Amino acid sequence: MVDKGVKIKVDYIGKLESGDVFDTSIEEVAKEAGIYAPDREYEPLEFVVGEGQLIQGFEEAVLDMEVGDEKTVKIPAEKAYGNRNEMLIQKIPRDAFKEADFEPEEGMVILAEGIPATITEVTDNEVTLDFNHELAGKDLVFTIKIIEVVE
């Protein structure tokens, strides 16, 4: 039971359109996904439906969830990162890869550490690697789980 202005310590297990746990507050699941991390400590994330903390979508899947509830739904890239961003559209010189089999293609997705570059342009002169994001223009699961309520 929360609203736009109520905090709640819930542990969601955001996954991928493939069911791959990418983010989880429950350290347990972390081990079930092989992401428990080294020393990292997966604790309950206290979000506030009235702070825009988490993506609305999820913020809504909890809006109607008491303390202890669980809603493993997939938020649409529209509610999550709201489709892809335009300010994430990069454009490197063909050379930026010409000297590397990296040969970008009009649909590539290479990251430099985590942020992929959706190469929407494959001009033999350059490529438009739309950085975007991992959940950019993509929907991801959310195995939320209310554990408490705060603010």
Swiss-Prot record:
One of its GO terms (biological process) is protein refolding. Thermostable. Residues 83-132 are annotated as: IF. It is an enzyme of class 5 (isomerase). It is found in: Cytoplasm. The keyword DNA damage does not apply. GO terms for cellular component: cytoplasm. It comes from the Archaea. Keywords: Chaperone, Cytoplasm, Isomerase, Rotamase. Its EC number is 5.2.1.8. Inhibited by FK506 but not by cyclosporine. Gene3D superfamilies: 3.10.50.40. It catalyses: [protein]-peptidylproline (omega=180) = [protein]-peptidylproline (omega=0). GO terms for molecular function: peptidyl-prolyl cis-trans isomerase activity. InterPro entries: PPIase_dom_sf, PPIase_FKBP_dom. Residues 8-109 form the PPIase FKBP-type domain. Catalyzes the cis-trans isomerization of peptidyl prolyl bonds and accelerates protein folding. Also exhibits chaperone-like activity. In vitro, can use oligopeptides such as N-succinyl-Ala-Leu-Pro-Phe-p-nitroanilide and N-succinyl-Ala-Ala-Pro-Phe-p-nitroanilide as substrates. Contains an N-terminal PPIase domain and an IF (Insert in the Flap) domain. The IF domain, formed by an insert in the flap loop, is required for the chaperone-like activity but not for the PPIase activity. Belongs to the FKBP-type PPIase family. This is Short-type peptidyl-prolyl cis-trans isomerase. It comes from Methanothermococcus thermolithotrophicus.
